[PDB]
């Protein structure tokens, strides 16, 4: 009883059975404040049974430094009572309440426990009752610039999935008598040792096709072994292997057992002694907070820091740690006691939500079990960070003035960014920006820009929107959420509607772009990221890059002359599969459902936009008679769709819905076995349809089978829709219709002049002339995954199953038909709020203006495995132009709008270089090897008017520059690369 | 990119392909029109095939879109044009030239592969009857990839 329709992107993560263990567990939260109301809205947008909220500290302003969820109106009450009633509205599956008083039965009725904000000995007093009672606890605390957590599912918890991966599959080419599997040509099977696989289909050795998982023993990139199985068989041929996936028991301690020894989770190996520090440091806290009342360390105070630093010497003392105290760290972690960052708030919120969620779902493998983070090297550097400076001003920013100070508080407020897109990662941004303070100043502004709509699917993982906003806008909802927030945002936000391409550029042009301060990206494509990262280049704008993938992120930042760009980089590409694969033998679920997308754009969206347009363009006919690739599939698919084949009722709809079945199911097949028959072999002996290729048999229709009802129904309702006809899905129609038809006999044919111009225009002139039908137009059928009510997933299930029955493939649902057809990414709410957390953790280094390329740091992390690494940014390429050391990315020439010749003969006088070839956009400007008359036509004209020339375009009013691509040789003849030319119109 | 396109471009200036012609359409570096010539050894003797060769944008880590245009009477391409070619599809790699492609395309023409067909028909008749598909062969390329 999930609903599909909010859960779509999260349960192609988790799956149907994670979601339903999930949605009967309760949490309960202790403590909400930033980090608290961060697990809180994760968990309730993750779909949780219900979500309980303790918190009877009543609020205060500084409070509001990462607490989304409260106002300048609240201050004096409760947080919990306060913030309930704005997390009820998130999700409307999972209800919140409101706690007055906790008693240690009482938290018996709950599945996890989160701990935050509690001093240690309460920690341990909970942490004591559910240790011995079965019941998930996470622990989570944020000070300043550092953080920690700690997990604690009980001594027998059961993992049954451990890296989020789905099975190991492949396929076998011959399986000795001594185990060895071999896998097929140039196929790596990529197990591990001691895993188990189970094998199905196998050709000679039956006994392995019962399906008991067997042991693993890796021999190679291509081959393993599974033992002896002598009695089984002597040898076997073909087959497929598929891995077992077994559950894991994993055995946790107690919170007053792991602090004497604890074990750590290493989020960084450059520093692997700071963990071991961090311990003794916030137990040091605790005990100092518990000896002042409650109170931590006041900001950059030294009398506290070194009383905290003796507290921190008594505990190395007391627990016996042979570990020696740095005393710098340990001090800067006093320092920043009281610090409230939102960027760690929302860090922290997205891990220790997924620690929630493994601990309902038994899924992924847990942080086990002291996971100590900090991002030191943020601290700023080029202000003044004191006692003075960092003490609080009665202000909503105290919690982040506490660790940067007002200066730095000062240069955030005057901030001018630039956000591409306003999805999960442009929410999050926006709503770390608003907290933050940035762009509140006078000379501050935000602009965001985004051109799609609310829809359905995206309220469950972008929080700024809600159910009465769908089909509004992105940016204008973002907007007045973020503005809403924190209201000196009022009027400091642009809004757009505007997609960022080569169409844009009078709109983000140079005046836009001379006045930011830094660009942030939170696309889903690789066109815009490239096309962003191409302005930023040319502007020299910092910029921030994020991208997520189910559980797993990453992060990047570009800085001007320091590190490469976005486009330095590749990525693995998309896979296709081979054409004479999809069109006559599949072997995978992927090839068939790729083959009816392609059948579907075929049947519904071609041939009406070739009808379309030949009753719109005039000339259409010749221009396709002389242009495209095959005139006569044109004119064929004009005159059926037209005359020969126009449905008058939906009664010839189903009637030609029954012929498209024949046509696609069994006749091209039988034709198919015709060809290649069943027993035929290769040219070198061995049979045709082995291995890879499955032999396909053909399909007769029976009505009562419901794949082939369905293919006829969405059929039938589709072609109606195309001819606007009113479609019907009561089965006694198709019942009635069907049974009155007659196939119409088939044959396989073997086979065995000028005429066929001839007969092209005798088939174009029997089709009626575009004068008798003037408004007349078909409706095409624009491919819609979101929307279940148009037949378009259900058509291309239908036709995808049929064709695994066809090659005895397994059918898959509509669930992962829509996956695969519909290009789906997974995405999550945590994955969203970590990399939010880290962009605005890097935010903090590029406002500070730092230099140094050790001090950045890209991120990447997996919270399926609980990986975090994070490394330096590669620095951006050096060459030698005429000796003297050029940066390949952030250099250009600067050159006035002179002619081409005078451009030559600037490079040869200046550069000592002689010029071959000289583009702009997509155009040759000039090549070496063009004929003279040509040059001696193109030399005396300006850079201007050479491209108005050449691409027979007008430059628009608002263009003011040119990007020239230049390739020039040495005076040996040698190449050597040398930037772009900025030429200034 | 576009430097890519140019430095590939001059490479078959410098040495010529004898064989192959590869050139921009107009002043366009995204839209190549190539020519290749039948293989002496083969029943295409004598033919002059025209492709069209199209660059993503994110050449050379995309695959180019070869297609025939001449129309040719072979296992392995179909009426399309489309040519069966594993290094188009899926084995691209950023580091093959349009020569490399040219040079494979012409050593497809020089042996047909019927054993993974593309046109099964045409894959049939050349298993079983091999002189009607000579007879054809040479027909189509008489008809079509002379004048
Ligand atoms: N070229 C572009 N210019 C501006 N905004 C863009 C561009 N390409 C994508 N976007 C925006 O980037 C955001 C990406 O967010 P996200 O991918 O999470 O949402 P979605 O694509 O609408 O949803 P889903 O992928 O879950 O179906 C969307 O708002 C999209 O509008
Ligand atoms: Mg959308
Ligand atoms: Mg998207």
Redesign the pocket.
């Given at each position: 009883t999930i609903d599909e329709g909010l859960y779509s992107?999260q349960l192609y993560v988790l799956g149907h059975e994670a979601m339903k263990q999930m949605s009967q567990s309760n949490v309960l939260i202790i403590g909400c404040k930033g980090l608290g109301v961060e697990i809180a809205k994760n968990v309730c947008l993750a779909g949780v049974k219900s979500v309980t909220l303790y918190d009877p500290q009543p609020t205060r302003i500084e409070d509001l430094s990462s607490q989304y969820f409260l106002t300048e109106d609240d201050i004096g009450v409760p947080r919990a009572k306060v913030t309930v009633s704005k997390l009820a509205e998130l999700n409307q599956y999972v209800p919140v309440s409101v706690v007055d008083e906790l008693s240690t039965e009482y938290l018996k009725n709950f599945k996890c426990v989160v701990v935050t904000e509690t001093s240690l000995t309460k920690q341990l007093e909970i942490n004591d009752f559910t240790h011995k009672n079965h019941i998930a606890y996470i622990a989570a605390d944020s000070r300043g610039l550092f953080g920690s957590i700690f997990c604690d599912f009980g001594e027998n918890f059961i993992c049954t999935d451990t890296d989020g991966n789905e099975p190991l599959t492949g396929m076998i080419a011959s399986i000795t008598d001594d185990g060895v599997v071999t896998m097929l040509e140039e196929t790596r099977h990529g197990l591990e040792n001691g895993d188990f696989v189970k094998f199905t289909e196998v050709k000679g050795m039956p006994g392995l096709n019962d399906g008991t998982p067997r042991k693993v023993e890796v021999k190679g990139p291509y081959t393993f072994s599974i033992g002896s199985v002598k009695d089984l068989g002597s040898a076997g041929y073909n087959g497929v292997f598929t891995q077992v996936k077994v559950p894991t028991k994993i055995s946790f301690k107690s919170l007053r057992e792991s602090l004497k020894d604890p074990e750590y989770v290493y989020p960084d190996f450059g520093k692997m002694m700071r963990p071991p520090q961090y311990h003794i440091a916030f137990q040091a806290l605790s005990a100092f907070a518990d000896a002042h009342e409650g109170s931590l360390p006041r900001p950059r105070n030294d009398i506290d820091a070194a009383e905290f630093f003796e507290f921190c010497k008594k505990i190395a003392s007391t627990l016996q740690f042979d570990v020696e105290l740095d005393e710098k760290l340990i001090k800067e972690i006093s320092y920043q006691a009281r610090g409230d960052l939102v960027a760690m708030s929302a860090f922290l919120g997205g891990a220790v939500a997924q620690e929630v969620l493994k601990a309902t779902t038994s899924k992924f493998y847990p942080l086990k079990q002291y996971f100590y983070f900090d991002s030191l090297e943020s601290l700023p550097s080029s202000v003044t960070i004191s006692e003075e400076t960092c003490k609080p001003r009665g202000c909503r920013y105290d919690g982040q003035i506490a660790v940067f100070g007002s200066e730095f508080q000062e240069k955030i407020a005057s901030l001018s960014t630039f956000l591409?897109?306003?999805?999960?990662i442009?929410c999050e941004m926006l709503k770390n920006w608003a907290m933050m303070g940035v762009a509140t100043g006078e000379s501050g502004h935000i602009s965001v820009?985004?051109?799609?709509s609310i829809?359905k699917?995206?309220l469950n993982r972008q929080f700024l929107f809600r159910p009465r906003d769908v089909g509004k806008l992105?940016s204008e909802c973002a907007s007045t959420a973020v503005s809403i927030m924190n209201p000196s945002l009022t009027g400091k936000i642009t809004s757009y509607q505007e997609?960022?391409?080569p169409e844009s550029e009078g709109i983000f042009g140079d005046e836009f772009f001379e006045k930011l301060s830094l660009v942030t990206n939170?696309?889903?494509?690789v066109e815009?990221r490239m096309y962003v990262d191409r302005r930023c280049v040319f502007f020299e704008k910092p910029l921030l890059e994020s991208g997520t993938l189910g559980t797993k992120g990453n992060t990047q930042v570009v800085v001007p002359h320091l590190t490469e760009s976005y486009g330095s980089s590749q990525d693995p590409p998309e896979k296709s599969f081979p054409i004479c694969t999809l069109k006559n033998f599949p072997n995978r679920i992927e090839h068939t459902i790729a083959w009816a997308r392609d059948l579907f754009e075929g049947l519904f969206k071609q041939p009406i936009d070739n009808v379309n347009m030949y009753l719109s363009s005039p000339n259409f006919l010749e221009t396709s008679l002389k242009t495209s690739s095959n005139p006569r599939e044109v004119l064929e698919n004009i005159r059926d769709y037209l005359v020969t084949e126009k449905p008058l009722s939906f009664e010839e709809c189903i009637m030609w819905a029954r012929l498209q079945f024949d046509k696609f199911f069994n006749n091209n097949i039988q034709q198919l076995l015709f060809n290649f028959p069943k027993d035929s072999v290769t040219s070198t002996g061995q049979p045709f349809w082995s291995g890879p290729k499955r032999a396909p048999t053909p399909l007769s229709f029976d009505i009562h089978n419901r794949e082939h009802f369905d293919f006829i129904v969405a059929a039938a309702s589709l072609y109606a829709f195309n001819y606007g006809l009113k479609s019907e899905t009561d089965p006694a129609i198709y019942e009635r219709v069907l049974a009155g038809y007659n196939p119409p006999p088939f044959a396989p044919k073997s086979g065995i002049a000028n005429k066929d111009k001839q007969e092209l225009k005798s088939i174009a002139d029997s089709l009626p002339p575009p004068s008798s039908l003037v408004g007349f137009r078909l409706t095409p059928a624009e491919f819609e995954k979101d929307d279940d009510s148009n037949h378009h997933i259900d058509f291309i299930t239908a036709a995808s199953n049929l064709r695994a029955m066809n090659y005895d493939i397994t059918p898959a649902d509509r669930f992962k038909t829509k996956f695969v057809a519909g290009k789906?990414?997974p995405?999550m709410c945590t994955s969203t709020a970590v990399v939010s957390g880290l962009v605005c953790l890097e935010l903090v280094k590029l406002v500070d203006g730092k230099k140094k390329i050790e001090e950045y740091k890209n991120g990447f992390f997996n919270l399926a495995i609980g990986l975090f690494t994070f490394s330096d940014p590669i620095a951006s390429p050096k060459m030698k132009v005429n000796g003297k050391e050029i940066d390949k990315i952030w250099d250009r020439y600067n050159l006035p709008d002179c002619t081409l010749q005078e451009l030559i003969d600037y490079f040869q006088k200046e550069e000592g270089l002689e010029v071959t070839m000289l583009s702009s956009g997509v155009s040759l400007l000039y090549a070496n090897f063009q004929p003279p008359k040509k040059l001696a036509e193109r030399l005396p004209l300006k850079i201007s008017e050479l491209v108005e020339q050449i691409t027979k375009k007008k430059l628009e009013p608002f263009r003011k520059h040119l990007v020239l691509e230049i390739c020039c040789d040495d005076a040996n003849g040698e190449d050597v690369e040398v930037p772009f030319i900025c030429i200034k119109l | 990119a576009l430097k890519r396109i140019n430095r590939e471009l001059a490479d078959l200036g410098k040495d010529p392909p004898s064989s192959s012609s590869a050139g921009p359409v107009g002043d366009d570096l995204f839209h190549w029109q190539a020519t290749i010539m039948g293989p002496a050894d083969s029943p295409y003797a004598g033919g002059v095939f025209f492709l069209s060769i199209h660059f993503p944008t994110d050449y050379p880590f995309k695959p180019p879109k070869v297609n025939f245009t001449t129309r040719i009477y072979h296992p392995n391409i179909n009426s399309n044009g489309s040519i069966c070619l594993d290094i188009l599809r899926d084995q691209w790699s950023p580091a093959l030239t349009i020569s490399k492609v040219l040079l494979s395309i012409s050593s497809l023409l020089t042996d047909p592969n019927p054993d993974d067909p593309l046109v099964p028909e045409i894959a049939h008749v050349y298993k079983t009857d091999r002189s009607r598909y000579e007879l054809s062969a040479r027909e189509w390329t008489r008809k079509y990839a002379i004048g």
């Open positions: 992107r591409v897109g306003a999805g999960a442009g820009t985004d051109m799609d829809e699917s995206n992105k997609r960022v391409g939170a696309l889903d494509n815009a789906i990414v995405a | -």
